[PDB]
Amino acid sequence: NIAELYGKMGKHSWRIMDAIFKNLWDYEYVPLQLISSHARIGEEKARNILKYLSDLRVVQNRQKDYEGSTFTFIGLSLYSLHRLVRSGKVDAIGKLMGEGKESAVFNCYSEKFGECVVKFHKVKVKEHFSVLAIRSARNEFRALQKLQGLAVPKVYAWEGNAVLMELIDAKELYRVRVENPDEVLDMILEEVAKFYHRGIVHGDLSQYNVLVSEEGIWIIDFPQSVEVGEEGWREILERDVRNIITYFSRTYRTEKDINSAIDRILQ
Ligand SMILES: Nc1ncnc2c1ncn2[C@@H]1O[C@H](COP(=O)(O)OP(=O)(O)O)[C@@H](O)[C@H]1O
Ligand SMILES: [Mn+2]
């Protein structure tokens, strides 16, 4: 369906989407007049385009205070895919691999990079969808770049809410029973130490974000990552270590002291 949606888009549609994208920095709902002026498409025609894009679930239009438009998740993903296609990084989008509360992950093929996944991202006052989703994608991309050569996917590109990376032929740890859990846990903790040496804390280390095969382990899912030195980095690192050791304790009864494991990494 994402491919079908893509095929409904003409040059004028992409220009309208570009105009929203380029004005997200200072509006959630970009005013019609700005979309029109940026796209160099007359207001009545721009309005007609935005109505059709809303019909296709690509934009959400509001009128409470003024006529304004923003991306839906589908629309931001579609636009980001377009940027990837136009930069020659992706040739065809393929089948959905899976979707949940934080992302939708699709298979795709790149003549340059081979079989890939593209991951579309979904998500100081504690109580701007697009701006936050783009920030999430950019963070994952930057973390993956910094960690290249370690046990993570090769990363190829980032546009909008999309990150293009290597497909890993491995399953989530959560789904795999290992017969050497103590060694597996040690390999994970060694990778945590290597990330830390590179100034990166994962931020969501879990049984759902470690992939395993007979061949080894990979770690994925970096939008929550922080740099060492950022507020709370140490407690976030401790959490990653505590959570993965706790998983192994509950599942395998491995005996690994959390305090010593943290202290070993940190020294
Ligand atoms: N590079 C990849 N190779 C293979 N499978 C992947 C890759 N990236 C994501 N996946 C699959 O998609 C799921 C969701 O990806 P993930 O990065 O964990 O995002 P989320 O935050 O939505 O959990 C993963 O648990 C994994 O099964
Ligand atoms: Mn995950």
Side-chain angles (χ1 to χ4, degrees), residues 1-123 125 127 129-267:
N1 198 244
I2 181 85
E4 308 181 312
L5 189 52
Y6 192 97
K8 298 221 209 286
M9 304 296 154
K11 296 188 197 194
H12 288 84
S13 286
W14 295 127
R15 287 169 56 198
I16 290 296
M17 282 185 251
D18 196 48
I20 298 171
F21 189 78
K22 291 290 174 53
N23 288 291
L24 287 174
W25 65 275
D26 70 329
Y27 294 97
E28 180 184 34
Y29 286 81
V30 184
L32 177 62
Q33 296 99 327
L34 263 195
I35 293 174
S36 173
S37 69
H38 186 290
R40 299 179 190 267
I41 292 166
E43 278 169 26
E44 186 185 356
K45 185 168 184 159
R47 188 185 290 105
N48 291 339
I49 296 160
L50 291 158
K51 293 179 186 277
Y52 181 57
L53 293 177
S54 170
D55 294 338
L56 295 180
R57 310 176 50 220
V58 162
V59 301
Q60 181 185 345
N61 301 316
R62 283 198 59 126
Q63 295 184 315
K64 181 186 83 166
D65 282 316
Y66 61 94
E67 286 191 82
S69 305
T70 197
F71 291 113
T72 62
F73 170 67
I74 287 173
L76 180 53
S77 299
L78 184 71
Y79 176 76
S80 297
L81 179 58
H82 183 64
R83 297 198 66 115
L84 286 173
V85 173
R86 294 270 320 301
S87 69
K89 301 289 173 36
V90 172
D91 301 311
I93 195 135
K95 290 178 75 171
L96 174 68
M97 184 189 278
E99 180 161 352
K101 291 154 157 195
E102 303 155 75
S103 76
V105 178
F106 286 78
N107 295 282
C108 62
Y109 188 79
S110 169
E111 299 169 11
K112 189 179 178 67
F113 302 117
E115 195 65 31
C116 296
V117 296
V118 57
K119 176 177 175 190
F120 297 112
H121 289 77
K122 286 184 174 187
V123 287
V125 176
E127 299 197 5
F129 168 82
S130 289
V131 168
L132 292 164
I134 299 163
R135 185 157 319 265
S136 290
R138 186 188 52 174
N139 199 49
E140 178 152 54
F141 176 75
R142 285 167 176 189
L144 288 165
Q145 285 196 307
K146 283 170 185 182
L147 298 176
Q148 292 290 273
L150 304 180
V152 298
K154 288 180 283 177
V155 68
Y156 305 133
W158 152 63
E159 294 289 352
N161 71 334
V163 178
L164 184 68
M165 72 184 87
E166 177 185 14
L167 168 72
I168 299 311
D169 190 13
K171 292 309 165 295
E172 289 181 18
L173 174 63
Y174 169 67
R175 291 177 69 209
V176 176
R177 263 210 195 281
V178 298
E179 297 302 350
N180 59 333
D182 290 82
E183 292 183 338
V184 176
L185 174 60
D186 285 350
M187 301 185 295
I188 295 162
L189 295 174
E190 185 56 44
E191 285 303 299
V192 172
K194 293 181 203 314
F195 293 179
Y196 165 67
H197 178 79
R198 299 219 184 162
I200 294 294
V201 184
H202 184 282
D204 194 23
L205 189 68
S206 79
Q207 62 264 41
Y208 307 110
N209 293 328
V210 180
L211 303 186
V212 288
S213 75
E214 306 91 309
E215 297 182 70
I217 65 130
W218 290 263
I219 298 171
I220 62 170
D221 199 4
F222 292 88
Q224 283 187 230
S225 59
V226 297
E227 288 181 354
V228 174
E230 279 194 63
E231 201 171 54
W233 73 270
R234 193 185 184 259
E235 292 70 42
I236 293 165
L237 180 155
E238 293 157 0
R239 184 179 71 188
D240 279 342
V241 170
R242 177 173 68 239
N243 284 347
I244 200 64
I245 291 175
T246 301
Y247 171 75
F248 274 85
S249 175
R250 292 168 182 168
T251 310
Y252 298 103
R253 311 307 286 202
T254 47
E255 301 183 328
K256 190 104 209 159
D257 176 64
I258 294 169
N259 188 244
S260 294
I262 285 167
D263 291 346
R264 187 166 179 165
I265 288 161
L266 283 170
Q267 53 90 40

